[PDB]
Amino acid sequence: CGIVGIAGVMPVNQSIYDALTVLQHRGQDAAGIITIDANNCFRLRKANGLVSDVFEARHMQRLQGNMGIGHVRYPTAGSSSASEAQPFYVNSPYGITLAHNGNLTNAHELRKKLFEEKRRHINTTSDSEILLNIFASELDNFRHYPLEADNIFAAIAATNRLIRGAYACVAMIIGHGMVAFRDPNGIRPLVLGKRDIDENRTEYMVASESVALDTLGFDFLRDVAPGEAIYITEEGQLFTRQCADNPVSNPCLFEYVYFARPDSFIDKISVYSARVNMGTKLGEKIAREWEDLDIDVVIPIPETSCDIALEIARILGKPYRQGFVKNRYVGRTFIMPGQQLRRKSVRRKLNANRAEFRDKNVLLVDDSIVRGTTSEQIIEMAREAGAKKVYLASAAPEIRFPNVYGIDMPSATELIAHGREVDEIRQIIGADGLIFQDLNDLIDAVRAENPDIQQFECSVFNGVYVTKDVDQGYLDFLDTLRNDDAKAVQRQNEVE
Amino acid sequence: CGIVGIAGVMPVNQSIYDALTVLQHRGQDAAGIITIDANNCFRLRKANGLVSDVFEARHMQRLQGNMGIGHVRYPTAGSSSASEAQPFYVNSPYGITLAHNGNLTNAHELRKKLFEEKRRHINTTSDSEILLNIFASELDNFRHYPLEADNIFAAIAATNRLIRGAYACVAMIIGHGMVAFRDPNGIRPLVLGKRDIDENRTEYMVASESVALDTLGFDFLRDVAPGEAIYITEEGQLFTRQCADNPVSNPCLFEYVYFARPDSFIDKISVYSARVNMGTKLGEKIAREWEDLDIDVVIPIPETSCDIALEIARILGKPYRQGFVKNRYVGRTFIMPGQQLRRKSVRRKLNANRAEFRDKNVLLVDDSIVRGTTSEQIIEMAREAGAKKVYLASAAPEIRFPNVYGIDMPSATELIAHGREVDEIRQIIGADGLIFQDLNDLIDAVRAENPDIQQFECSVFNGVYVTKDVDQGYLDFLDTLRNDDAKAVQRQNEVE
Amino acid sequence: CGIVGIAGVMPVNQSIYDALTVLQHRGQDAAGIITIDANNCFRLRKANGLVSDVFEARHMQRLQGNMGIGHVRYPTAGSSSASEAQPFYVNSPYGITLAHNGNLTNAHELRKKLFEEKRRHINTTSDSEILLNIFASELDNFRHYPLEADNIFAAIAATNRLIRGAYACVAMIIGHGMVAFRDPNGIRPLVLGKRDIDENRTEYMVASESVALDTLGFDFLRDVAPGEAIYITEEGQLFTRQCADNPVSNPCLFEYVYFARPDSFIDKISVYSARVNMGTKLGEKIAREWEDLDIDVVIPIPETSCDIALEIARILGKPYRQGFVKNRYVGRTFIMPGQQLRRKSVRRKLNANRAEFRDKNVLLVDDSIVRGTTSEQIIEMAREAGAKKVYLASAAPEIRFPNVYGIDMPSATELIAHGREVDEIRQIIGADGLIFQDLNDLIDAVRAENPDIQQFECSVFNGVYVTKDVDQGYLDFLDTLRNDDAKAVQRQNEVE
Amino acid sequence: CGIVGIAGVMPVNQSIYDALTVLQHRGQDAAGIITIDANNCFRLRKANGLVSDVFEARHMQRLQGNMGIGHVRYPTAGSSSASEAQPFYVNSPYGITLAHNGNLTNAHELRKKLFEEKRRHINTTSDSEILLNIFASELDNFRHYPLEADNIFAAIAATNRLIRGAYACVAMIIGHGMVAFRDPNGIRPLVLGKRDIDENRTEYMVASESVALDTLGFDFLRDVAPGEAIYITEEGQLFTRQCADNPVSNPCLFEYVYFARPDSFIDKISVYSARVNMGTKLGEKIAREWEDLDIDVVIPIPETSCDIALEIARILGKPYRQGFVKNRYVGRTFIMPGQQLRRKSVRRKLNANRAEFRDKNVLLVDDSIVRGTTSEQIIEMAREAGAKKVYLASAAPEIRFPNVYGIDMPSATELIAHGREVDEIRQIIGADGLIFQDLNDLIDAVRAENPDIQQFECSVFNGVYVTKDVDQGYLDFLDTLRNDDAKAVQRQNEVE
Ligand SMILES: Nc1ncnc2c1ncn2[C@@H]1O[C@H](COP(=O)(O)OP(=O)(O)O)[C@@H](OP(=O)(O)OP(=O)(O)O)[C@H]1O
Ligand SMILES: [Mg+2]
Numbered sequence A, B, C, D: 001c002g003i004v005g006i007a008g009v010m011p012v013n014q015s016i017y018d019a020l021t022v023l024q025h026r027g028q029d030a031a032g033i034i035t036i037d038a039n040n041c042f043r044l045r046k047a048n049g050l051v052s053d054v055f056e057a058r059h060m061q062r063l064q065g066n067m068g069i070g071h072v073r074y075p076t077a078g079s080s081s082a083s084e085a086q087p088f089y090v091n092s093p094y095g096i097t098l099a100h101n102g103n104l105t106n107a108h109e110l111r112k113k114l115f116e117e118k119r120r121h122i123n124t125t126s127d128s129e130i131l132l133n134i135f136a137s138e139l140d141n142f143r144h145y146p147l148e149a150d151n152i153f154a155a156i157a158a159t160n161r162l163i164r165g166a167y168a169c170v171a172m173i174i175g176h177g178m179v180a181f182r183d184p185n186g187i188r189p190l191v192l193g194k195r196d197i198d199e200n201r202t203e204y205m206v207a208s209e210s211v212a213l214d215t216l217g218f219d220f221l222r223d224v225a226p227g228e229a230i231y232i233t234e235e236g237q238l239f240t241r242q243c244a245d246n247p248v249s250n251p252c253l254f255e256y257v258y259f260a261r262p263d264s265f266i267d268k269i270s271v272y273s274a275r276v277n278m279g280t281k282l283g284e285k286i287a288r289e290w291e292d293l294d295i296d297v298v299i300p301i302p303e304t305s306c307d308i309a310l311e312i313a314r315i316l317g318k319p320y321r322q323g324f325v326k327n328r329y330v331g332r333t334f335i336m337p338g339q340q341l342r343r344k345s346v347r348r349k350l351n352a353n354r355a356e357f358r359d360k361n362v363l364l365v366d367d368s369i370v371r372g373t374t375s376e377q378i379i380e381m382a383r384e385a386g387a388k389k390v391y392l393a394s395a396a397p398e399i400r401f402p403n404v405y406g407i408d409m410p411s412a413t414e415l416i417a418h419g420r421e422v423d424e425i426r427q428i429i430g431a432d433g434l435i436f437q438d439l440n441d442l443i444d445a446v447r448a449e450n451p452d453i454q455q456f457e458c459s460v461f462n463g464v465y466v467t468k469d470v471d472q473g474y475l476d477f478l479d480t481l482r483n484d485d486a487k488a489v490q491r492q493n494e495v496e
């Protein structure tokens, strides 16, 4: 998921729209924009689909005001395609809306506590609504009006004490302004920017990645610190505060591997440079451990791995060639009566340049291996194109554990690397050779760009969950949400 | 506006849809249906347009559950075409949704009190949202769970003490059931019905008119009494209570004149029979006061006045003839560039049977006269068809005051009868003769069908407002809402 | 179906739209408008649904020009809801478009001749496309340019020699103007009008009924004569010609019974006056043959029969009362899985005023009886409302044969009156008494308004087909078209 | 534009849809699919937008049959976004549909001849409709039925004698089969394929590029020869014929520079290999003529030029870096009243990685330079990102003349290179250095992959038009089409 918040001095609807379009890679299932208009009323538009589909002209005239937030959704457990999208809002106290990228590992406990202690009903299975109501709950304790910046930060600190997990948040409070905060482990990305209009008026904005600042012409200020809260008033004043105890920087490693855009700077690390480094480490590991193998060419599985594969081919002194081409437009397969629905995917997504594989030992480079069924089909494509020996290299280490911090991933039993050594995986997907990035090499590659980062969020690779509340009972709660997600999507399909 | 609530034992989405389609005459601007599904979650669909336009197949699969309410909107001050429609809902306490037909005369005072005392933000200008939050406010005072029927009735009584005006309401409370109540003056119509499925399970429903019960096969029980509250639990148990002090039955007279359907029974009065009576009284007044006039034929302005005109023609011993035909489908006029937009309305709505007017002194019968510009154009049509003397009779008395109890009407300065005697109106609209129903005759005609009714709501005719809080300052508040309503509709038109 | 053609001197898009809206009662399945723009290019918009749904703003800007035709479709065999709508057009010779109300009884033979002799492919099962191509064929024989009025009339005469059946047509020929013609039996309605703009420029139009002329402010000239052709040039000149031998006036009787609007004048006969006369004749027949029966009240099945029942009640000296109310809005029934829909199919269209039936012997009046399942269910409603004896009277004679002249009707085996006497029908539908208009009385009632009309098209009542080419082979051709139409409609819902 | 034709033995709707999605890069303005169903009837769906927007489920059930063609449109003169899209069809003779990629340079003369000699009206400004009608004309000369393969080839040969320009075409003839042909200069790309189902049944298809064959699993046979015609019968038989005299292979050079996909093989030339060769030639020219310049890094303007810049960086022994990232999703800019849009038009498409430009002399590589305003703004981005000296290299030679063979380009007066030397252009766009590919080097690079190709279509670079009918009169005809196209597009937004 991706989030945007613009506290400006002129209409922000188009800017939020433009900022979401450059974060569209963080989620293409749904989109939502909400603004505070001249009467201090939320104005909202959200629906399923791409940003360019969700917001028509008639919806943009509705989104009046100089302050607003936006959200694009990646389908996760609890926030399915058939579900209501973000942002949510409650009308008491004062009026609050919130957009969220991440996941709360104690969502179930929080929902119970909200109902019993506050009689606050949660109408969806999205943990973002829960986070919103916790925050609204803590804000309701203050009776005097208006709230002071210290009240709002106090409410944010109380929230960080109650909730566990990973979250980058932006929110608005009618009559006050815009806030943004980050989990105490700094897992999910969030950056702050500004744009000076004159010596009196300055606009601010936050976003999941710096590219959203670049595209609008905002000067980059800094990443929002772990546990830090940003508050920008309706007049245009910026306040900050540390709202967590023992904050630490444990940025998500997956952001650098493939999820974030290469032209972004997350916690002072160029995603592009990090990915080039990954290819250096992986190319070095390959030259060391596959010295005896005959590799004719290095070919990337586009698009994420093109720069990584270029560096590997350099380390190995081997040619780089564009053997696979990814179609920019995919298109849907229709549920067809009296027509065969036996087509296998991946042929839509990718195509093979037949001349680049014929009678060659090829080294394919992909960003990661999850289920392996996709990887199998890519290797099959190479063989059908004429490749003899087909070797596969993964920019990421083996993916053995589910992510519970905002990155949608299948359960452990669906991960091919779960409970298997490398050779088993190789034999299953049909490769002649298979190699994975060493986790220490991946850490070094990203850590090289910012040595201040001591540890990263590596749960999917090593099973170490930094929040320390991931047990089998919690994993079962998520599999329940996924069961209900499938039933809601299925019922929509029948009705169409 | 019209409302429906069905507390059933099997899915209610289609029933609510079908019930709204037979109440569509109470408002064609927007529609909304909301249900409580098997997970005790509100499921909602609302938008602008007709019932048959708003609810597609994909929206009806979303509306799962055995309990729900529906609403169709007539555009009023505060609830414009460009606005968010009903029903609204809040997620605290417990979860409440409400649909409303009427108007709160102290909406401004209530909005202030809600913000200061409860920090409850009202995001729209609809008084229905205000009514919802007052009710939610009183429900939040109870901390123990679950609420008892006496808690809910206590909250309704507290609400009736705070709010003033006219309202028929239906609402749901997650985890409890469905409630419905009526203003202490019984101004807005509301009836209760049931449908027995077996000796253990009975379904209940409420609606603005009895035709909604008829069309679904529900047995009519009774009108909801003035100030009375109905409560139906999730198990299927019915409770009632008087929730107002000094309740009285002052049913709206306009419902009988034209707004309600003729096959409905409102407060034990057949709307059809009431309208026939109106023609008897008006035919008697005409024979008395226009003895010397030469009337060739009685012609109704369809559709409401066909039965009224039939009775007048009978009293006068004169022929009845269908001189005007109303087109069932109207269609829109497009804002056209390089095309003349000088067309006058009424020709779309009505057409004249040329042979029924030629060389005749015609007595036209309409249900009421409001602005008079429409009436002028109807008289003009008759003359263009060949009529010599054109006389006009109004089933309703002169309309001199605005309605503030839920019937959308223009301000007093826009009412032709405001500050004018009959002959002035006649001279302005271009009639050779003009006559109005005497208010006492109208009361007798409706009161004849149920002599228990001592007084009716007659504010638009005599300026007597039964709630006793209609001053010039309140009339100014409504003209502000209408100013903002026009600006919102205008901005939508520009953007299309 | 209904048709409109406007040969004007200023944009006609809105005029055609407005004229179709008052002809919408002739078909609500699809609508189409096509104009000739300033570059002599057809500009088209057609789709399924009502006029008000089909034509958005974006389509009306496309419909530029001062000449155009329109069509609204009633679902028939070969042109189902799932099919391509009217108007059709071919781009050779010159460019021709046509709209048509009626039916060709030799459609199969014509399609064959078109394929073998002219290699003209007919892409749909609509007989209108065939009619367009026959006319286009005859127009291609003339080689010199431009065509002269006599050329076009010659082509129309040649077409009338080839095609058999009933048809009212309007068409345009690029570079020439607009034509309109009528079948040699004058079965389908068509009227001509004009509107003077100044001493130099006059606009003309044609339409199925005179109400389309009235609503746009066109002066009625006359019905287009049987077999006559009208031609209106781009300059604004009117020419005519008799283009059939042995033209005769056998106007469709159903137009007067229920299909046309009451304020229309078809062949100088007021539909309204004709229907009152029908009620006079039937009231006279009822009093004679049911002298001994006890009738409490006369109640019409709305809407067509309200005036007919009023006249019957007058002849019988009995009260008239609105016992049935037709629901103005119907709405769709959604295909629902695992869901009981217990609304009755008769309750969809009608509702019963319970107080008007209870403990009375009622005489229901309907316009006609076709399948009888509907009549059965309406009689059932009356009994459930409290009626004791329920008698039924049909404004039309028994319907025993299918209509092949443009009025959609089921086959003879589906008509309850087919091969049955009156009393058998009575026993099947559950009436205590059943009586039909005598065909001779129906002719008298319509003939009274214009004795010049000697005979009418009465095939559905007596089986006399004036075209004399209705054999078993044509009936099988129609049941084949109905079979394929159902499979196409089924496939749309399958995929929806 | 791009075209597809599938003559199969099982439903082709999804296959055509899938093939257009991998040809979507050839035109994103409109899309169209038409099939011949079991009753030998054209079944069509076309509209504006992307393939994934144009074809819903309801349209794919309509597209029944085992034979069909498809088209995706690039906006050109005469077929603007606001215009009717391809494919077109006529219903005489027999029924013919056609899809076309290219442009007819004698369109005006052809429209005249069609009107006078054949009275065939052309309803749009698309030259494809003209091409369809010429072919239909020649097919009508044959009177006996069925047509024989030699008849159809005779009609194609006659058409090639009449029409001038560049064209790749696919078409269907009801009752016969599918045809495809290529202009006598082999300018526009077209390839043929097959797919064996069993020893009895083989499917065939044609398409603009080989990637459409690959993605569906069709074996590549060969490019359709210049002037050659392909005919595939409904039974599954392949015939061919040379249908032009003096056919020659002058393939479009732009296809290789940027327009075609890199994994395609056009006339036995890999687009990917050709582009690498272009970069080799340009890198060699740069090292020779810019020996003395200080270049820090080579940066491509994505996406077409990434591989070209990679090869340049290799020749120069300099680092390659992803300095520019192309935004995958662009989104629309809404016409906003009273609202400042301060996003820059270059920022819409591209974003700059600030760290890759700061304090470096950068060599930007783009595929071509047309207007120069874009290049100016990209150079400006580099400087704002921190670049010192910014040098620009164009993979294509200077573009001085308009393309009249199917590639949309502005007129010569809008081309910055028109009437200017290299250094003047450099001064205007703001580069510190500017260099272009030598046309002779470009020919060598493409010619290396297939020396059998002696000459290419190079009109845009050198003004040599191989058709020899590009005069000032045709250029005025095109600027007229562009004028009317703009007025139609303007009128759509006015009314939206
Ligand atoms: N001259 C013209 N220039 C530009 N665009 C034109 C056009 N003539 C037609 N179109 C468009 O192209 C489609 C034609 O298909 P039809 O609607 O007639 O038929 P269908 O295939 O059975 O659905 C339509 O778009 P749409 O995406 O189906 O959406 P709307 O039905 O909501 O409108 C129409 O808007
Ligand atoms: Mg929607």
Ligand SMILES: [Mg+2]
Pocket (backbone or CB within 6 Å): B047
């Ligand atoms: Mg919507």
Ligand SMILES: [Mg+2]
Pocket (backbone or CB within 6 Å): C047
């Ligand atoms: Mg459409």
Ligand SMILES: [Mg+2]
Pocket (backbone or CB within 6 Å): D047
């Ligand atoms: Mg459309």
